[PDB]
Scaffold this motif. Structure first.
Motif, mmCIF file in Angstrom:
data_model
loop_
_atom_site.group_PDB
_atom_site.id
_atom_site.type_symbol
_atom_site.label_atom_id
_atom_site.label_comp_id
_atom_site.label_asym_id
_atom_site.label_seq_id
_atom_site.Cartn_x
_atom_site.Cartn_y
_atom_site.Cartn_z
ATOM 1 N N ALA A 241 0.849 -1.184 0.000
ATOM 2 C CA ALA A 241 0.000 0.000 0.000
ATOM 3 C C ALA A 241 0.890 1.241 0.000
ATOM 4 C CB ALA A 241 -0.927 -0.014 1.208
ATOM 5 N N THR A 242 1.321 1.654 -1.190
ATOM 6 C CA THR A 242 2.390 2.668 -1.322
ATOM 7 C C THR A 242 1.975 4.130 -0.998
ATOM 8 O OG1 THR A 242 2.176 2.615 -3.753
ATOM 9 C CG2 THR A 242 3.898 1.232 -2.790
ATOM 10 N N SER A 243 0.793 4.278 -0.385
ATOM 11 C CA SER A 243 0.220 5.585 -0.008
ATOM 12 C C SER A 243 0.712 6.195 1.330
ATOM 13 C CB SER A 243 -1.307 5.505 -0.013
ATOM 14 O OG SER A 243 -1.737 4.511 0.900
ATOM 15 N N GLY A 244 1.440 5.429 2.153
ATOM 16 C CA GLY A 244 2.193 6.004 3.287
ATOM 17 C C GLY A 244 3.270 6.972 2.787
ATOM 18 N N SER A 245 4.078 7.517 3.698
ATOM 19 C CA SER A 245 5.079 8.531 3.344
ATOM 20 C C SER A 245 6.484 8.279 3.933
ATOM 21 C CB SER A 245 4.594 9.908 3.777
ATOM 22 O OG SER A 245 5.576 10.902 3.525
ATOM 23 N N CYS A 246 7.520 8.658 3.168
ATOM 24 C CA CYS A 246 8.922 8.566 3.612
ATOM 25 C C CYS A 246 9.423 9.789 4.377
ATOM 26 C CB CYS A 246 9.860 8.273 2.431
ATOM 27 S SG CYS A 246 9.655 6.588 1.829
ATOM 28 N N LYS A 247 8.521 10.740 4.617
ATOM 29 C CA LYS A 247 8.799 11.912 5.440
ATOM 30 C C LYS A 247 9.480 11.500 6.764
ATOM 31 C CE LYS A 247 6.212 15.098 8.317
ATOM 32 N NZ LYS A 247 6.832 16.447 8.223
ATOM 33 N N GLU B 216 13.800 -2.422 8.227
ATOM 34 C CA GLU B 216 12.869 -2.553 7.112
ATOM 35 C C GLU B 216 11.484 -2.907 7.652
ATOM 36 O OE1 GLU B 216 14.102 -6.152 5.020
ATOM 37 O OE2 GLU B 216 12.267 -6.139 3.836
ATOM 38 N N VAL B 217 10.458 -2.216 7.160
ATOM 39 C CA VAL B 217 9.084 -2.557 7.532
ATOM 40 C C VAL B 217 8.473 -3.611 6.582
ATOM 41 C CG1 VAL B 217 8.541 -0.589 9.020
ATOM 42 C CG2 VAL B 217 8.271 -0.370 6.531
ATOM 43 N N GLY B 218 7.515 -4.381 7.106
ATOM 44 C CA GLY B 218 6.913 -5.502 6.377
ATOM 45 C C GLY B 218 5.648 -5.122 5.622
ATOM 46 N N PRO B 219 5.399 -5.786 4.468
ATOM 47 C CA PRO B 219 4.167 -5.557 3.689
ATOM 48 C C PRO B 219 2.864 -5.729 4.506
ATOM 49 C CG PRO B 219 5.740 -6.798 2.368
ATOM 50 C CD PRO B 219 6.343 -6.673 3.751
ATOM 51 N N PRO B 220 1.786 -5.025 4.114
ATOM 52 C CA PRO B 220 1.762 -4.105 2.975
ATOM 53 C C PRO B 220 2.072 -2.636 3.327
ATOM 54 C CG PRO B 220 -0.451 -5.006 3.484
ATOM 55 C CD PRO B 220 0.440 -5.200 4.683
ATOM 56 N N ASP B 221 2.774 -2.394 4.443
ATOM 57 C CA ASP B 221 3.291 -1.047 4.760
ATOM 58 C C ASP B 221 4.388 -0.682 3.754
ATOM 59 O OD1 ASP B 221 1.663 -1.523 6.921
ATOM 60 O OD2 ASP B 221 3.338 -1.891 8.303
ATOM 61 N N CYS B 222 4.415 0.567 3.300
ATOM 62 C CA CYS B 222 5.411 0.942 2.295
ATOM 63 C C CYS B 222 6.782 1.250 2.913
ATOM 64 C CB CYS B 222 4.923 2.070 1.376
ATOM 65 S SG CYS B 222 4.609 3.671 2.158
ATOM 66 N N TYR C 48 12.414 -4.287 -4.398
ATOM 67 C CA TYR C 48 11.222 -5.041 -4.045
ATOM 68 C C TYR C 48 9.937 -4.460 -4.653
ATOM 69 C CZ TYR C 48 13.374 -7.880 -0.214
ATOM 70 O OH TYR C 48 14.092 -8.792 0.527
ATOM 71 N N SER C 49 10.044 -3.396 -5.457
ATOM 72 C CA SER C 49 8.852 -2.615 -5.901
ATOM 73 C C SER C 49 7.934 -2.177 -4.744
ATOM 74 C CB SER C 49 8.008 -3.406 -6.920
ATOM 75 O OG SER C 49 8.527 -3.291 -8.224
ATOM 76 N N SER C 50 8.497 -1.557 -3.712
ATOM 77 C CA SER C 50 7.745 -1.337 -2.491
ATOM 78 C C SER C 50 7.924 0.031 -1.829
ATOM 79 C CB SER C 50 8.078 -2.447 -1.493
ATOM 80 O OG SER C 50 9.437 -2.351 -1.111
ATOM 81 N N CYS C 51 8.610 0.959 -2.494
ATOM 82 C CA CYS C 51 8.873 2.273 -1.897
ATOM 83 C C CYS C 51 7.581 3.046 -1.779
ATOM 84 C CB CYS C 51 9.842 3.098 -2.742
ATOM 85 S SG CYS C 51 11.414 2.268 -3.122
ATOM 86 N N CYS C 52 7.498 3.918 -0.776
ATOM 87 C CA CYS C 52 6.371 4.851 -0.691
ATOM 88 C C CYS C 52 6.370 5.778 -1.890
ATOM 89 C CB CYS C 52 6.383 5.680 0.593
ATOM 90 S SG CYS C 52 6.394 4.690 2.116
ATOM 91 N N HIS C 53 5.170 6.300 -2.184
ATOM 92 C CA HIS C 53 4.921 7.195 -3.302
ATOM 93 C C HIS C 53 5.927 8.335 -3.437
ATOM 94 C CE1 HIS C 53 2.720 9.652 -0.227
ATOM 95 N NE2 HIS C 53 3.011 10.661 -1.027
ATOM 96 N N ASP C 54 6.392 8.908 -2.304
ATOM 97 C CA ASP C 54 7.273 10.106 -2.269
ATOM 98 C C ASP C 54 8.759 9.817 -2.015
ATOM 99 O OD1 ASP C 54 6.998 9.287 0.392
ATOM 100 O OD2 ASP C 54 5.985 11.138 1.000
ATOM 101 N N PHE C 55 9.141 8.560 -2.190
ATOM 102 C CA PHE C 55 10.533 8.172 -1.965
ATOM 103 C C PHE C 55 11.506 8.924 -2.870
ATOM 104 C CE2 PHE C 55 14.264 5.524 -2.729
ATOM 105 C CZ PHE C 55 14.734 5.310 -1.444
ATOM 106 N N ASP C 56 11.246 8.974 -4.182
ATOM 107 C CA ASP C 56 12.166 9.702 -5.079
ATOM 108 C C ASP C 56 12.285 11.159 -4.690
ATOM 109 O OD1 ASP C 56 13.053 7.752 -7.339
ATOM 110 O OD2 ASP C 56 10.898 7.552 -7.439
ATOM 111 N N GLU C 57 11.135 11.799 -4.461
ATOM 112 C CA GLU C 57 11.099 13.230 -4.138
ATOM 113 C C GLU C 57 11.878 13.533 -2.855
ATOM 114 O OE1 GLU C 57 8.055 16.770 -2.677
ATOM 115 O OE2 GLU C 57 7.191 14.772 -2.993
#
Ligand SMILES: *[C@@H]1O[C@H](CO)[C@@H](O[C@@H]2O[C@H](CO)[C@@H](O[C@@H]3O[C@H](CO[C@H]4O[C@H](CO)[C@@H](O)[C@H](O[C@H]5O[C@H](CO)[C@@H](O)[C@H](O)[C@@H]5O[C@H]5O[C@H](CO)[C@@H](O)[C@H](O)[C@@H]5O)[C@@H]4O)[C@@H](O)[C@H](O[C@H]4O[C@H](CO)[C@@H](O)[C@H](O)[C@@H]4O[C@H]4O[C@H](CO)[C@@H](O)[C@H](O)[C@@H]4O)[C@@H]3O)[C@H](O)[C@H]2NC(C)=O)[C@H](O)[C@H]1NC(C)=O
Ligand SMILES: CN1CCC(NC(=O)c2ccc(Nc3ncc4c(n3)n(C)c(=O)n4Cc3ccccc3)cc2)CC1
Ligand SMILES: Cn1c(=O)n(C)c2nc(Nc3ccc(Cl)cc3)ncc21
Ligand SMILES: [Ca+2]
Ligand SMILES: [Ca+2]
Ligand SMILES: [Cl-]
Ligand SMILES: [K+]
Ligand code: NA
Ligand SMILES: [Zn+2]
Length: 805
Positions: free
Chosen positions: A3-9, A17-23, A32-41
């Motif tokens: 659920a990639t809608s959490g945040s890397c803030k 490392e956190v476990g699925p489905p936490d991002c 793993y194709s699992s980074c939060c939506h804002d990881f790049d930013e």
């Protein structure tokens, strides 16, 4: 699902490392194709690049920038690595003289010098000299710290096996990562470079350094970086972690670079295109050292610069095809390339036959560039057999070559100019080691050593107890200023018996005969003295080997040799003799050709018998101390004692006789005397460890005489060859081998020629460390020398390679 809608803030490159489905926001989330939506930013900022410029100095902090040059950056721990140089008039680390680091100079709060492992893929040993002009930072680490001329990788000389061996201290057969590609028949699962099966923890055995640290309360940075994270960001992230509060900050870190391997595959190891990748790696090292210098950590951190393997010239046209040898090529699966592993395409095909596959692959073409083996017959030094993921059939490929199944595989799957994976003794496969820091020695060169040794040392650097591994702990003490590990010699488990004369000749009914009944008091006291050990100091130069398991054995003394004779295996575990430069080679006299003599110190019930050999049509016999090197005609009779006899296939006797008649004397003249210890090895389950008696699969027909799988010899002399082997004041020199005891010489394609054309080449292929022989025999050698124990441990790990310089 993630659920990639959490945040890397506030979570960028988090350590747990956190476990699925936490991002996820850790350095592996991309993979793993699992980074939060804002990881790049948030986490992979690139704005304004990686270096401060004159005009950015004292800038107002802009959180969008890749790194910072504002006044607050040092306390935030996120300056560009060149900040103090551009903005505060400091020098680059590479421009400072080196000065010995006698003690760690660490900031308040540091409990131990941190360890940073800087690993480089495909970094061939000779790059240190050949690329020196373009790698000033790496050259400064190398010349100021501790370095070896090269470091030996493990076989196969591929990335996954070697990086995981670096982390665990284990041979690939024990850690389970036996190639870059694998099939495990128990799991019925395949492991591949691409895809998700490789993330499953069941592939990865042993205990890697990050787990060792964690279990012992030492925090670790994560050792794996997603490929798309740029090097500059990896370094910056390490440097930020180093600014964490004491309670949160790791003590061990790893950086990994895909270069120069990536370019080496495309351009070859010395392609003109390789200069740039080497410059770029050097710049990365410079960024790390400047960053450490800003943090006042550059005389606090131990840095290890280490490669996984080298790189060789390999092109598409140098490919052998199995379809040129086998008619049934569609019935096999080959793992191809710089090694071959063969198994049946289908387990339901009972027509498939490994014996006939091996034969169709054996010495079929004049300059054939691979050699087939059953895995248990591979040189023991490779330690590449005891794993279900290693196929029974293996192809050792010549350096510079590939093997493939069919030509279509090579053009429908020339691109590449470099590859690796060959025999780990090959010069082009060797890689690098440099250690720099308070715990390593200053400006010190150390001899080449194997990468299996490093885990122990990294554990020493961090005050950790290593998990059980294949290093020999203490053998790398000479790399270190302090934190040495001071092992004690293992205790002997079994004490020998010293039998005197106990049996009359007529009590023996062994079917043996000897023409020896031909009758002195000037000389009778002499033979008695020799049988009581009077020459033992000459032939047993480093003390008797210790027996480290429970067994019954006798020490037998003779004029020319001493042996430890096993009442259980009915032959010596070891036979020790010294041959001086002056020694003469004689022949076996005609009347003594088939002579075998009862040993009146050893009961008939604990002796071999000649009748068993007569009756066994396949098996013949040889001697451990060779009759050709007897010191006198009278001493020669001792060499024909039934207690010096060992079973040998006729084909192997060709090898053994040439070693004993020609090579021993050759080494004695070259090395100024040699001490030789020879014996049998039994490793029927190919685990690299001494078999117990209930593991023996083959006996001389009709007897309890066990058949060795291998014969070893350890040949020791003075490192200073101006001194004779028997009067050496200083360090020793050694070479050893573990020769497979085979009923044919199919391994040697030129064996119908004279032994002078093929035997020595065979023995070089089967070169070994004394430590390999220890594992295989449960013996411990060099118990009584004048040398320090750590030095002897280094000598025991030595491998004489027979590669040019
Ligand atoms: C290089 O260094 C390494 C590390 O020191 C050396 O390897 C060790 O050798 C030991 C002796 O062989 C061995 O000890 C055995 O352990 C058995 C328990 O094993 C598990 O637990 C350990 C501890 O955490 C773990 O490390 C193991 O990990 C292995 O297996 C997993 C899963 O398969 C893999 O992921 C991993 O890669 C690793 O695999 C490797 O080792 C196994 C063998 O353990 C191989 O089969 C693989 O091919 C691979 O190479 C395990 O998860 C324990 O059960 C054994 O005890 C048996 O033997 C004793 C003798 O003392 C006997 O008294 C017992 O009865 C028992 O026998 C019973 O089981 C038999 C088999 O089913 C059966 O026949 C009997 O009838 C009995 O029922 C044994 O003590 C240790 O495991 C490994 N460790 C590692 C990491 O490999 C290696 O020798 C060194 N090499 C050289 C050349 O020196
Ligand atoms: C043409 N090209 C050929 C090569 C191809 N690429 C690959 O096959 C590849 C990619 C990424 C990694 N990365 C990697 N990083 C850290 C590792 C590690 N692997 N292993 C196995 C470890 O144990 N550690 C931990 C560690 C770190 C540091 C030291 C010791 C152990 C490896 C290999 C790409 C195309
Ligand atoms: C620690 N160490 C070392 O630095 N060298 C150079 C060594 N050489 C040998 N053996 C060796 C064997 C045959 C010949 Cl002809 C010459 C040397 N053993 C150990 C060695
Ligand atoms: Ca690699
Ligand atoms: Ca064994
Ligand atoms: Cl592989
Ligand atoms: K025979
Ligand atoms: Na042959
Ligand atoms: Zn590669």
């Amino acid at each position: 699902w993630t659920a990639t809608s959490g945040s890397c803030k506030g979570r960028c490159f988090e350590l747990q490392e956190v476990g699925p489905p936490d991002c996820r926001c850790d350095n592996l989330c991309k993979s793993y194709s699992s980074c939060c939506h804002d990881f790049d930013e948030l986490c992979l900022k690139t704005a304004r690049g990686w270096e401060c410029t004159k005009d950015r100095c004292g800038e107002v902090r802009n959180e969008e920038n890749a790194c910072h040059c504002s006044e607050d950056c040092l306390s935030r721990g996120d300056c560009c690595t060149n900040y103090q140089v551009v903005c505060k008039g400091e020098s680059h680390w590479v421009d400072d003289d080196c000065e010995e680091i006698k003690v760690p100079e660490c900031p308040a709060g540091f409990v131990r010098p941190p360890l940073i492992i800087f690993s480089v893929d495909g970094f061939r040993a000779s790059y240190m000299k050949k690329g020196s002009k373009v790698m000033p930072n790496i050259e400064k680490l190398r010349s100021c710290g501790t370095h070896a001329p090269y470091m030996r990788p493990v076989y196969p000389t591929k990335t996954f096996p070697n990086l995981y061996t670096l982390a665990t201290g284990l041979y690939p057969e024990s850690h389970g990562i036996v190639g870059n590609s694998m099939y495990d028949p128990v799991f019925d699962a395949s492991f591949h470079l691409r895809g998700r099966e490789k993330f499953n923890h069941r592939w990865w055995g042993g205990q890697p350094l990050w787990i060792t640290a964690t279990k012992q309360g030492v925090r670790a940075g994560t050792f794996f970086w997603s490929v798309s994270i740029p090097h500059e960001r990896r370094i910056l992230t390490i440097l930020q972690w180093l600014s964490l509060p004491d309670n949160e900050r790791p003590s061990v870190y790893a950086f990994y670079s895909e270069q120069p391997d990536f370019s080496g595959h495309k351009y070859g190891p010395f392609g003109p295109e390789m200069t740039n990748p080497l410059r770029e790696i050097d710049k990365t090292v410079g960024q790390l050292m400047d960053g450490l210098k800003q943090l006042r950590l550059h005389r606090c951190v131990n840095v290890i610069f280490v490669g996984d393997h080298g790189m060789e010239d390999v092109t598409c046209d140098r490919t052998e095809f199995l379809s040129n040898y086998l008619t049934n090529v569609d019935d096999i699966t080959l793992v191809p390339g710089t090694l071959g592993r063969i198994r049946a395409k289908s387990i339901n095909n009972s027509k498939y036959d490994p014996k006939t596959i091996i034969a169709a692959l054996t010495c079929k073409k004049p300059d054939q560039h691979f050699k087939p083996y059953m895995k248990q017959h591979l040189p023991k030094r490779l330690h590449y057999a005891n794993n279900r993921r290693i196929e029974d059939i293996h192809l050792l490929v010549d350096r510079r070559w590939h093997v493939a199944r069919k030509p279509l595989d090579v053009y429908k799957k020339c691109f590449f100019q470099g590859d690796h994976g060959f025999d780990n003794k090959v010069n082009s496969m060797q890689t690098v080691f440099v250690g720099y820091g308070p715990t390593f020695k200053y400006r010190t060169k150390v001899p080449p050593f194997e990468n299996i040794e490093l885990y122990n040392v990294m554990c020493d650097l961090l005050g950790l107890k290593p998990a059980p591994n294949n290093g020999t702990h203490g053998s790398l003490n000479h790399l270190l200023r302090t934190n040495t590990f001071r092992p004690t010699m293992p205790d002997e488990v079994s004490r020998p018996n010293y039998p005197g004369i106990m049996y009359l000749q007529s009590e023996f009914d062994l079917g043996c005969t000897c023409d020896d009944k031909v009758e002195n008091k000037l000389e009778e006291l002499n033979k008695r003295l020799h049988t009581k050990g009077s020459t033992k100091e000459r032939h047993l130069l480093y003390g008797r080997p210790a027996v480290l398991y429970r067994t019954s054995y006798d020490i037998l003394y003779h004029t020319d040799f001493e042996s430890g004779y096993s009442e259980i295996f009915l032959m010596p575990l070891w036979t020790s003799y010294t041959i001086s430069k002056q020694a003469e080679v004689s022949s076996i006299p005609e009347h003594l050709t088939n002579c075998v003599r009862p040993d009146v110190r050893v009961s008939p019930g604990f002796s071999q018998n000649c009748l068993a050999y007569k009756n066994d049509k396949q098996m013949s016999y040889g001697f451990l101390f060779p009759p050709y090197l007897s010191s006198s005609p009278e001493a020669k009779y001792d060499a024909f004692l039934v207690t010096n006899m060992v079973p040998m296939y006729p084909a192997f006797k060709r090898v053994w006789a040439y070693f004993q008649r020609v090579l021993v004397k050759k080494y004695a003249s070259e090395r100024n005397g040699v001490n030789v210890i020879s014996g049998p090895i039994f490793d029927y389950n190919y685990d690299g460890l001494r078999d117990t008696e209930d593991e023996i699969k083959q006996y001389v027909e009709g007897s309890s005489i066990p058949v060795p799988t291998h014969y070893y010899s350890i040949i020791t002399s003075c490192l200073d060859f101006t001194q004779p082997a028997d009067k050496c004041d200083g360090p020793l020199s050694v070479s050893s081998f573990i020769l497979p005891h085979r009923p044919d010489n199919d391994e040697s394609c030129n064996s119908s020629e004279d032994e002078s054309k093929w035997v020595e080449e065979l023995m070089k292929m089967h070169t070994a460390r004394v430590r390999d022989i220890e594992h295989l025999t449960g013996l411990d050698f060099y118990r009584k020398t004048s040398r320090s124990y750590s030095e002897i441990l280094t000598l025991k790990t030595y491998l004489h390679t027979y590669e040019s310089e």
